[PDB]
Design a protein around this motif. Structure first.
Motif, PDB file in Angstrom:
ATOM      1  N   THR A 279       1.049  -1.117   0.015  1.00 23.13           N
ATOM      2  CA  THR A 279       0.047  -0.120   0.081  1.00 23.13           C
ATOM      3  C   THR A 279       0.872   1.254   0.171  1.00 23.13           C
ATOM      4  O   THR A 279       0.802   2.023  -0.811  1.00 23.13           O
ATOM      5  N   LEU A 280       1.685   1.212   0.885  1.00 22.46           N
ATOM      6  CA  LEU A 280       2.834   2.413   0.998  1.00 22.46           C
ATOM      7  C   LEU A 280       3.466   2.682  -0.326  1.00 22.46           C
ATOM      8  O   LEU A 280       3.712   3.620  -0.757  1.00 22.46           O
ATOM      9  N   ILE A 329      -5.562   6.368  -1.865  1.00 21.74           N
ATOM     10  CA  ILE A 329      -4.618   5.402  -2.153  1.00 21.74           C
ATOM     11  C   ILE A 329      -5.033   3.942  -1.797  1.00 21.74           C
ATOM     12  O   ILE A 329      -4.848   3.186  -2.801  1.00 21.74           O
ATOM     13  N   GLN A 330      -5.512   3.703  -0.773  1.00 19.54           N
ATOM     14  CA  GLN A 330      -6.070   2.531  -0.461  1.00 19.54           C
ATOM     15  C   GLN A 330      -7.078   2.122  -1.382  1.00 19.54           C
ATOM     16  O   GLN A 330      -7.349   0.965  -1.798  1.00 19.54           O
ATOM     17  N   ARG A 331      -7.874   3.120  -1.981  1.00 14.77           N
ATOM     18  CA  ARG A 331      -9.081   2.763  -2.909  1.00 14.77           C
ATOM     19  C   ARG A 331      -8.423   2.640  -4.193  1.00 14.77           C
ATOM     20  O   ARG A 331      -8.988   1.794  -5.197  1.00 14.77           O
ATOM     21  N   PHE A 332      -7.592   3.680  -4.814  1.00 14.87           N
ATOM     22  CA  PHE A 332      -7.025   3.448  -6.092  1.00 14.87           C
ATOM     23  C   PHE A 332      -6.095   2.211  -6.544  1.00 14.87           C
ATOM     24  O   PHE A 332      -6.326   1.477  -6.987  1.00 14.87           O
ATOM     25  N   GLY A 333      -5.404   2.052  -5.337  1.00 12.95           N
ATOM     26  CA  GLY A 333      -4.555   0.921  -5.186  1.00 12.95           C
ATOM     27  C   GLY A 333      -5.251  -0.390  -5.140  1.00 12.95           C
ATOM     28  O   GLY A 333      -4.945  -1.187  -5.962  1.00 12.95           O
ATOM     29  N   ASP A 334      -6.375  -0.577  -4.348  1.00  7.03           N
ATOM     30  CA  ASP A 334      -7.119  -1.530  -4.476  1.00  7.03           C
ATOM     31  C   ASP A 334      -6.319  -3.123  -4.272  1.00  7.03           C
ATOM     32  O   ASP A 334      -6.332  -3.933  -5.411  1.00  7.03           O
ATOM     33  N   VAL A 335      -5.520  -3.222  -3.294  1.00  7.47           N
ATOM     34  CA  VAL A 335      -4.645  -4.061  -3.126  1.00  7.47           C
ATOM     35  C   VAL A 335      -5.214  -5.740  -2.919  1.00  7.47           C
ATOM     36  O   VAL A 335      -4.287  -6.434  -3.679  1.00  7.47           O
ATOM     37  N   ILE A 336      -6.311  -5.872  -2.524  1.00  8.01           N
ATOM     38  CA  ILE A 336      -6.888  -7.092  -2.704  1.00  8.01           C
ATOM     39  C   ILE A 336      -8.207  -6.841  -3.353  1.00  8.01           C
ATOM     40  O   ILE A 336      -9.294  -6.897  -2.770  1.00  8.01           O
ATOM     41  N   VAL A 448      -2.210  -7.750 -11.507  1.00 12.12           N
ATOM     42  CA  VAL A 448      -3.685  -7.793 -10.770  1.00 12.12           C
ATOM     43  C   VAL A 448      -4.093  -9.271 -11.083  1.00 12.12           C
ATOM     44  O   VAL A 448      -4.486  -9.544 -11.907  1.00 12.12           O
ATOM     45  N   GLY A 449      -4.268  -9.858  -9.955  1.00  9.55           N
ATOM     46  CA  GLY A 449      -4.815 -11.219  -9.817  1.00  9.55           C
ATOM     47  C   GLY A 449      -5.513 -11.169  -8.390  1.00  9.55           C
ATOM     48  O   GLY A 449      -6.667 -10.659  -8.440  1.00  9.55           O
ATOM     49  N   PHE A 450      -4.892 -11.754  -7.524  1.00  4.13           N
ATOM     50  CA  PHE A 450      -5.515 -11.897  -6.241  1.00  4.13           C
ATOM     51  C   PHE A 450      -5.327 -10.583  -5.358  1.00  4.13           C
ATOM     52  O   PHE A 450      -5.989 -10.206  -4.527  1.00  4.13           O
ATOM     53  N   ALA A 451      -4.267 -10.012  -5.857  1.00  2.00           N
ATOM     54  CA  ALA A 451      -3.722  -8.577  -5.412  1.00  2.00           C
ATOM     55  C   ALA A 451      -3.365  -7.737  -6.373  1.00  2.00           C
ATOM     56  O   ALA A 451      -3.325  -8.321  -7.453  1.00  2.00           O
ATOM     57  N   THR A 452      -3.408  -6.389  -6.229  1.00  2.00           N
ATOM     58  CA  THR A 452      -2.794  -5.454  -7.026  1.00  2.00           C
ATOM     59  C   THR A 452      -1.273  -5.246  -7.038  1.00  2.00           C
ATOM     60  O   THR A 452      -1.181  -4.660  -5.882  1.00  2.00           O
TER      61      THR A 452
END
Ligand code: HEM
Ligand SMILES: C=C1CC[C@@]2(C(C)C)C[C@@H]12
Length: 465
Positions: A279-280, A329-336, A448-452
């Motif tokens: 995320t960072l 960032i948390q929204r754009f990043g969309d990590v999971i 982008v699969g399970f995570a971004t």
């Protein structure tokens, strides 16, 4: 009734042909244009109900929280956990460990001053290690994940790793690769064809060894704690669980045995590190891409904390603009982006669909985070998404990066803190100049699969002037 509609599956391979393994997210978004926000897909033999958009996801995970509290699967990970440990566990096992873990985490300072300091300290150590580069151009990947992993490791092992530790690096490397792997094309191909691909050569083999490598580390870590255990004073999370293991030794229905100890610690290790690390890592890449947003961030830092004292967590409530930026960032990043798979605990009537006991639910968190009903131009990175007309912080019911409902991320607490502090601190102490010009930076993910997964980049941290 009957199941969510969806494309018609061929035998064994399910809906392969209506999917693209490199772009699972897009592929399912593409299909939702054809079947609505609530559909069925077939990932090889796994029959899955895809949920899309704020409403569908909420109505399931929240309004029917209990029915949807099951845990579905994530084939790569589950290869190692085999249903043991807090995450990939179900039922009695799951309720037991989740309880213990939330409680224990809290006992070792989570949500409190106890871990806020531990965080402020490790943030200290980072700034040092970054000034230590003295303006040089670097890949922040490991600097970041070293710092993050130390907060969670501090808790579960009761002692930080020294940045120089050749092992610490080794492990960090592994989590990266696992996450990286599971977000590749093959990684998603494995979700569909695991019962075959497990016995074949290919990237998943390297992937398996990476997890085995982490279980080995953990297992060796645990045994040292047994051999030196003071059942009266626990140093770390592992002790608490051991202490508890001893107590439950006569109870044959107990969920506290060794396997569950190892796997829950592994869970906590991987889950606690790679998600925040990433995320960072994305945030910095975005901040660099919007110097407009960079400046405004500095301004609100100078004006509210100054370059004088170090940041405190309550310092977040006087600083909407940084909250807005971390959110964005948390929204754009969309990590999971697709969450972790859930499962239905019993036969369930949802809207006017019927979902059998045990069917998998992929709750497309990304589709919520990008729901244009709650974010105009959801596709843009722009903190105004989380800012009203008068420059205040505006909540959003669609901000779901930690998922929602009965098995949602119980690390959100710790995570929010780690996130605010590190971002704020690094910003106070440096300005960011990219190895390229803001006009060139490409922020779209490498995978982008399970995570971004954000693309790879280098950057310099320069002092402020
Ligand atoms: C950006 C940071 C993080 C994000 C975006 C994130 C996201 C998520 C998501 C999507 C889930 C699945 C929710 C579901 O059950 O459907 C989850 C669960 C979980 N998270 Fe995180 N997480 C983050 C950080 C952390 C941290 C810091 C920890 C621990 C320190 C952690 C530990 C866990 C565990 C153990 C679960 C499983 C919960 C359960 O099965 O009961 N995560 N998180
Ligand atoms: C053990 C892990 C690895 C990644 C993970 C996150 C979503 C908490 C599922 C947890």
């Amino acid at each position: 009734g009957k199941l969510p509609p969806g494309p018609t599956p061929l035998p064994f391979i399910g809906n392969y042909l209506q999917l693209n393994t490199e772009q699972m997210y897009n592929s399912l978004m593409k299909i939702s244009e054809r079947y609505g926000p609530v559909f069925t897909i077939h990932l090889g033999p796994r029959r899955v109900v895809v949920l899309c958009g704020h409403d569908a996801v909420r109505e399931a995970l929240v309004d029917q929280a209990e029915e949807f509290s099951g845990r579905g699967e994530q084939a790569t990970f589950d290869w190692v956990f085999k249903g043991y440990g807090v995450v990939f566990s179900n039922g009695e096992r799951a309720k037991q460990l989740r309880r213990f873990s939330i409680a224990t985490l809290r006992d070792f300072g989570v949500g409190k001053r106890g871990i806020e300091e531990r965080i402020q300290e490790e943030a200290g150590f980072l700034i040092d290690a970054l000034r230590g580069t003295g303006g040089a151009n670097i890949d922040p990947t490991f600097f970041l994940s070293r710092t993050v992993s130390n907060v969670i490791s501090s808790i579960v092992f009761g002692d930080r790793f020294d940045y120089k530790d050749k092992e610490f690096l080794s492990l960090l490397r592994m989590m990266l690769g696992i996450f990286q792997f599971t977000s590749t094309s093959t990684g998603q191909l494995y979700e569909m064809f695991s019962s075959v691909m497990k016995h074949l050569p290919g990237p998943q083999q390297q992937a398996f060894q990476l997890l085995q490598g982490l279980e080995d580390f953990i297992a060796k870590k645990v045994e040292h704690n047994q051999r030196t255990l003071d059942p009266n004073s626990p140093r770390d999370f592992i002790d608490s669980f051991l202490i508890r293991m001893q107590e439950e030794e006569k109870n044959p229905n107990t969920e506290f045995y060794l396997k569950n100890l190892v796997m829950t610690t592994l869970n906590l290790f991987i889950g606690g590190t790679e998600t925040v690390s990433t995320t960072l890592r994305y945030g910095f890449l975005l901040l660099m891409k919007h110097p407009e947003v960079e400046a405004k961030v500095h301004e609100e830092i100078d004006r509210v904390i100054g370059k004088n004292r170090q940041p405190k967590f309550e310092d977040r409530a006087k600083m909407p603009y940084m909250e807005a930026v971390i959110h964005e960032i948390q929204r754009f990043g969309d990590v999971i982006p697709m969450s972790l798979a859930r499962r239905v605990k019993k036969d369930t009537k949802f809207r006017d669909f019927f979902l059998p006991k045990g069917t998998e639910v992929y709750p497309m968190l990304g589709s919520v985070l990008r729901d244009p009903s709650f974010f105009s131009n959801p596709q843009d990175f722009n903190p105004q998404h989380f800012l009203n007309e008068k420059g205040q912080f505006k909540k959003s019911d669609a901000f779901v990066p930690f998922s929602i409902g009965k098995r949602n991320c119980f690390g959100e607490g710790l995570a929010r803190m780690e996130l605010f502090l590190f971002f704020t601190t690094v910003m106070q102490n440096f300005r960011l100049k990219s190895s390229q010009s803001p006009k060139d930076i490409d922020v779209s993910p490498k995978h982008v699969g399970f995570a971004t997964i954000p693309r790879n980049y280098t950057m310099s941290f320069l002092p402020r002037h």
